Design a protein around this motif. Structure first.
Motif, mmCIF file in Angstrom:
data_model
loop_
_atom_site.group_PDB
_atom_site.id
_atom_site.type_symbol
_atom_site.label_atom_id
_atom_site.label_comp_id
_atom_site.label_asym_id
_atom_site.label_seq_id
_atom_site.Cartn_x
_atom_site.Cartn_y
_atom_site.Cartn_z
ATOM 1 N N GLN A 51 10.802 -45.524 20.741
ATOM 2 C CA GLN A 51 10.338 -43.961 20.232
ATOM 3 C C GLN A 51 10.585 -43.034 20.054
ATOM 4 N N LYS A 52 11.583 -43.758 18.994
ATOM 5 C CA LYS A 52 12.583 -42.551 17.761
ATOM 6 C C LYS A 52 12.165 -42.650 16.186
ATOM 7 N N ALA A 53 12.033 -41.719 15.590
ATOM 8 C CA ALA A 53 11.985 -41.911 13.783
ATOM 9 C C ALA A 53 13.623 -40.891 13.183
ATOM 10 N N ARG A 54 13.244 -41.676 12.158
ATOM 11 C CA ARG A 54 14.860 -41.472 11.459
ATOM 12 C C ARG A 54 14.302 -41.430 10.134
ATOM 13 N N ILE A 55 15.056 -40.076 9.591
ATOM 14 C CA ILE A 55 14.339 -39.530 8.754
ATOM 15 C C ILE A 55 15.836 -39.249 7.160
ATOM 16 N N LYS A 56 15.984 -39.718 6.647
ATOM 17 C CA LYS A 56 16.450 -39.743 5.415
ATOM 18 C C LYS A 56 16.358 -39.001 4.623
ATOM 19 N N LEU A 57 16.970 -37.715 3.479
ATOM 20 C CA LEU A 57 16.943 -37.208 2.627
ATOM 21 C C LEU A 57 18.099 -37.294 1.639
ATOM 22 N N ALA A 58 17.314 -37.026 0.905
ATOM 23 C CA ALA A 58 18.063 -36.953 -0.735
ATOM 24 C C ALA A 58 18.084 -36.352 -2.320
ATOM 25 N N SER A 59 18.739 -35.466 -2.683
ATOM 26 C CA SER A 59 18.211 -34.438 -3.415
ATOM 27 C C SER A 59 19.931 -34.196 -4.456
ATOM 28 N N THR A 60 19.778 -33.905 -5.451
ATOM 29 C CA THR A 60 20.456 -33.151 -6.556
ATOM 30 C C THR A 60 20.757 -31.992 -6.454
ATOM 31 N N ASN A 61 19.910 -31.650 -6.235
ATOM 32 C CA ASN A 61 19.888 -29.586 -5.398
ATOM 33 C C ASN A 61 20.206 -29.225 -3.608
ATOM 34 N N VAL A 62 21.189 -28.867 -3.657
ATOM 35 C CA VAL A 62 21.867 -29.000 -2.242
ATOM 36 C C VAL A 62 20.885 -28.341 -1.309
ATOM 37 N N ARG A 63 19.801 -26.484 -2.482
ATOM 38 C CA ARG A 63 19.629 -25.492 -2.019
ATOM 39 C C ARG A 63 18.252 -25.709 -1.009
ATOM 40 N N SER A 64 17.579 -27.140 -2.049
ATOM 41 C CA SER A 64 16.100 -27.552 -1.399
ATOM 42 C C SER A 64 16.415 -28.541 -0.499
ATOM 43 N N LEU A 65 17.455 -29.245 -0.468
ATOM 44 C CA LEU A 65 17.847 -29.719 0.478
ATOM 45 C C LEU A 65 17.773 -29.046 2.122
ATOM 46 N N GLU A 66 19.095 -28.235 2.196
ATOM 47 C CA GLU A 66 18.951 -27.198 3.212
ATOM 48 C C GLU A 66 17.660 -26.962 3.247
ATOM 49 N N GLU A 67 16.247 -26.290 2.663
ATOM 50 C CA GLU A 67 15.004 -25.504 3.252
ATOM 51 C C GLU A 67 14.169 -26.790 3.570
ATOM 52 N N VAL A 68 14.501 -28.032 3.383
ATOM 53 C CA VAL A 68 13.650 -29.524 4.194
ATOM 54 C C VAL A 68 14.523 -29.208 5.549
ATOM 55 N N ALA A 69 15.493 -29.815 5.538
ATOM 56 C CA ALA A 69 16.272 -29.498 6.736
ATOM 57 C C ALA A 69 15.977 -28.274 8.397
ATOM 58 N N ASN A 70 16.161 -27.566 6.992
ATOM 59 C CA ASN A 70 15.259 -26.201 7.744
ATOM 60 C C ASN A 70 14.005 -25.902 8.544
ATOM 61 N N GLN A 71 13.310 -26.635 7.796
ATOM 62 C CA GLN A 71 11.981 -27.050 8.257
ATOM 63 C C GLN A 71 11.610 -27.273 9.499
ATOM 64 N N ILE A 72 12.474 -28.522 8.764
ATOM 65 C CA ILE A 72 11.931 -29.787 10.191
ATOM 66 C C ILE A 72 13.195 -29.288 11.415
ATOM 67 N N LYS A 73 13.749 -28.817 11.275
ATOM 68 C CA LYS A 73 14.676 -28.141 12.172
ATOM 69 C C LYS A 73 13.632 -27.417 13.214
ATOM 70 N N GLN A 74 13.651 -26.072 12.481
ATOM 71 C CA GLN A 74 12.522 -25.198 12.820
ATOM 72 C C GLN A 74 10.700 -26.067 13.178
ATOM 73 N N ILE A 75 10.254 -26.783 13.164
ATOM 74 C CA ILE A 75 9.126 -27.811 13.294
ATOM 75 C C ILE A 75 9.898 -28.228 14.927
ATOM 76 N N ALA A 76 10.805 -29.276 14.972
ATOM 77 C CA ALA A 76 10.909 -29.738 16.044
ATOM 78 C C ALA A 76 11.694 -28.594 17.097
ATOM 79 N N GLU A 77 11.434 -27.391 16.258
ATOM 80 C CA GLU A 77 12.052 -26.169 17.852
ATOM 81 C C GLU A 77 10.605 -25.193 18.713
#
Ligand SMILES: [Mg+2]
Ligand SMILES: [Mg+2]
Ligand SMILES: [Mg+2]
Ligand SMILES: [Mg+2]
Ligand SMILES: [Mg+2]
Ligand SMILES: [Mg+2]
Ligand SMILES: [Mg+2]
Ligand SMILES: [Mg+2]
Ligand SMILES: [Mg+2]
Ligand SMILES: [Mg+2]
Ligand SMILES: [Mg+2]
Ligand SMILES: [Mg+2]
Ligand SMILES: [Mg+2]
Ligand SMILES: [Mg+2]
Ligand SMILES: [Zn+2]
Lengths: 55, 64, 196, 100
Positions: free
Chosen positions: D1-27
């Motif tokens: 009943q849980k989903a696992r998401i894996k992210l990988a990138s060579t640019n740190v800022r874009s990774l942070e943006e995607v993670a923040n968007q997911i966090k806001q969606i969950a919030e």
RNA sequence: UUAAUUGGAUUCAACGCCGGGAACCUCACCGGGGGCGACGGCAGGAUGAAGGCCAGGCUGAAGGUCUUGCCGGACGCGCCGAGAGGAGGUGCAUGGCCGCCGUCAGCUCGUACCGUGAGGCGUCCACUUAAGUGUGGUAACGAGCGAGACCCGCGCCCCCAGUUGCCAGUCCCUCCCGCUCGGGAGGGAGGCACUCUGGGGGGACUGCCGGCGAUAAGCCGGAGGAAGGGGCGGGCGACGGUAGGUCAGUAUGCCCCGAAACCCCCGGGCUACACGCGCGCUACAAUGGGCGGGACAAUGGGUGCCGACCCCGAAAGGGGGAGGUAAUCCCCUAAACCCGCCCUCAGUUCGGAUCGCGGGCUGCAACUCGCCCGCGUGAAGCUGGAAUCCCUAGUACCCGCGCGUCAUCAUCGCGC
């Protein structure tokens, strides 16, 4: 058949089984992580691939 | 050789004359003031400027 | 594993870029971009003369799409052609233009001065041009033209200055052209402003 | 009943943006999300001789490529699942979703 | 020396260098055998061009060619131009890249001024700095590139985050010991404390104190501090020169070959050996050799692959095979070091070159010319002349390990 006197044998190992995908040289080929590039060609295209000299 | 850099001296002198009544003989106060009054982003450069400003304040107060 | 995936994609772009650079030389090629969509791939090409790229109502775009799909690994390609953003701030374009001007038959000093004048007119902080080869005789020589602000060494020189190189094939041999340009918005570490 | 998401990138800022968007969606919904866990960075280092010929002192180049990674766990709820399914990642970020 | 033992490099700055650990390939050398001329035109060509084959000779082997006759239908190297291709010449025709002078502190510009002129000044003097780095004086006053600033990592603290990483406290179950008051080990719940992983932030500034210097620039010495005076280690090398190296990585002008100097296949060579030299490994023993036992890592890598676990074998190895596209599974329980016994200053229980017999792995192929194991054999060497190299702190010495090359092969390179 006369065309059979120009085709090469299909080798699977040895120095003759690998060529640079950019210049076709045999010898010093970098095989790390699937790259197929000479040591000469890798120096001049490394920045385009995203590599950097940090230290 | 601990020789101060030219642009550090220049910006420090410019700041001192613009706001003479803004800096004290305390390093922390000058550090915060330099942080807020300029657009410097490097933490090292800020410390250099603040130290030189402190020296200038104590030198003018003594009257040379 | 995951590392092999990233390297594989980077090589494809390098090969495609080199092929297009050699192919679209007369059209003022200025780079490319590849985007992946669920339907396929969007390939954006930057050029100065889109007419040469399209080539008289198709018959060239279809050929490029076919070559990209067959020779390279792109799946369901779709080519769009656009215009270069800042042609006078791109070093590669200027180097190729200078090389073509030399191949036409213009004296190298005139070409260098015209290029520097245009680049500085369009709002650049500094520019440098170097030309090497068998200029005026059979003993090779190098000449250098410069004006403005330009940072040669250190990290800022690596990340702010735009660089380009080109080859000019004349009757007597090849001539090398190097161009370096600094954008108007570049700020060096020791440029500090006082907030009023 | 849980989903696992894996992210990988060579640019740190874009990774942070995607993670923040997911966090806001969950919030913006009532749903518990395990925070973005930073996994070890991948370093690819290649050392090459500089000169084309063999004459002169030997000098070397050390080229390096860095790949950053993140991990997120979230419980499968369709109201929030559709929202994260419709987010658009930059071209230099790789995302993978699996249900556990 | 040879059929060939392909070629480049000769002080620093050639000689484990060309990532050069070549069995075939690589290959450029030697012996031998075959194949190749877009496009224009000339002889010729359906009454069939160009091209291909069952069998058997020539042959190392070959429809390559010949013998023997079957094939297919539009071009045509028997001829002339032209062309493909060239690791053929030229690095003293070039581009790009690299070494050295040198990470040295240098190289210039605008206007003014001095000299008929080449030129000079600024860029000089005193003190100071790792630095043309600074402070004062000056026919100079001001600018640019280099230095510094900048970027990456290491050491101390805080916030956020808790899986594939961590297990201290609390609970339950099982098993051991001195029989259990007490002390241990696993497993499950449960937790993010601690370690770690990685985003953000703090912290050091000659800031404080005492001297020298000029009261400037700075220098010397102390407190506190994880850290003290570029905090430590790296990346980035100015205008030029060196006719330095590379056309045998790729790009490229000229000259050559163009039915061979182009393209394939087989067998040899680059591995030869009176001798001179460079860099190293192993030793000449007790600051040891052997046998049994006991301890503690990090960096990296894995699907053409890493392979735990079981079985067979004295060893090298062999037959099955979980998990792993990887903070999850695997390479992976390092050596120097410590404890007990034998040897007691000897060419030996030191040294292990050389050679005989036998067993294996990779590979299409192991003789020239590969690597591993068992038994046997047992060379020089007993500390090194004149000379000469590296290194200032987690550095040098000593000890092993990882990756590159790689089907198999490490006395090497880059790292730990
Ligand atoms: Mg030789
Ligand atoms: Mg080698
Ligand atoms: Mg070999
Ligand atoms: Mg050979
Ligand atoms: Mg030369
Ligand atoms: Mg005069
Ligand atoms: Mg003088
Ligand atoms: Mg200077
Ligand atoms: Mg610097
Ligand atoms: Mg020369
Ligand atoms: Mg040899
Ligand atoms: Mg012995
Ligand atoms: Mg043999
Ligand atoms: Mg002895
Ligand atoms: Zn290459």
């Amino acid at each position: 058949a006369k065309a059979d006197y120009n085709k090469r044998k299909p080798r699977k190992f040895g120095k003759g089984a690998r060529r640079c995908i950019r210049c076709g040289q045999y010898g010093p080929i970098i095989r790390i992580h699937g790259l197929m590039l000479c040591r000469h060609c890798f120096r001049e295209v490394a920045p385009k691939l995203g590599f950097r000299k940090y230290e | 050789g601990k020789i101060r850099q030219g642009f550090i001296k220049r910006v420090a002198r410019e700041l001192f004359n613009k706001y003479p009544n803004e800096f004290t003989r305390d390093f922390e106060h000058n550090k915060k003031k330099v942080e807020e009054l300029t657009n410097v982003t490097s933490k090292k450069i800020r410390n250099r400027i603040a130290g030189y400003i402190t020296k200038l304040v104590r030198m003018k107060e003594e009257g040379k | 594993a995951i590392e092999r995936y990233f390297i594989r994609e980077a090589v494809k772009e390098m090969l495609i870029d080199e092929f297009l650079e050699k192919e679209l030389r007369r059209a003022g090629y200025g780079g490319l971009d590849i985007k992946k969509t669920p339907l396929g791939t969007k390939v954006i090409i930057f050029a100065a003369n889109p007419g040469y790229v399209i080539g008289r109502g198709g018959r060239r775009i279809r050929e490029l799409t076919r070559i990209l799909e067959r020779q390279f690994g792109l799946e369901n390609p779709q080519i769009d052609v656009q215009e270069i953003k800042n042609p006078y701030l791109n070093a590669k374009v200027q180097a190729v233009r200078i090389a073509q001007a030399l191949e036409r038959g213009i004296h190298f000093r005139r070409a260098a001065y015209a290029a520097m004048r245009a680049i500085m007119s369009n709002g650049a902080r500094g520019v440098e041009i170097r030309i090497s080869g068998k200029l005026t005789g059979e003993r090779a020589k190098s000449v250098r033209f410069y004006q403005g602000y330009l940072a040669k060494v250190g990290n800022p020189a690596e990340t702010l200055v735009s660089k380009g190189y080109a080859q000019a094939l004349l009757k007597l041999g090849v001539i090398g052209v190097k161009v370096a340009i600094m954008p108007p918005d570049a700020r060096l570490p020791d440029e500090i402003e006082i907030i009023e | 009943q849980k989903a696992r998401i894996k992210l990988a990138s060579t640019n740190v800022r874009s990774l942070e943006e995607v993670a923040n968007q997911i966090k806001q969606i969950a919030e913006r919904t009532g749903v518990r999300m395990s925070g973005p866990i930073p996994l070890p960075t991948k370093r690819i280092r290649i050392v090459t001789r500089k000169s084309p010929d063999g004459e002169g002192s030997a000098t070397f180049d050390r080229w390096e490529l860095r790949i950053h990674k993140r991990l997120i766990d979230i419980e499968a709820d369709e109201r929030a699942m559709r929202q994260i399914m419709r987010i658009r990642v930059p071209e230099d970020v790789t995302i993978e979703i699996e249900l556990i």
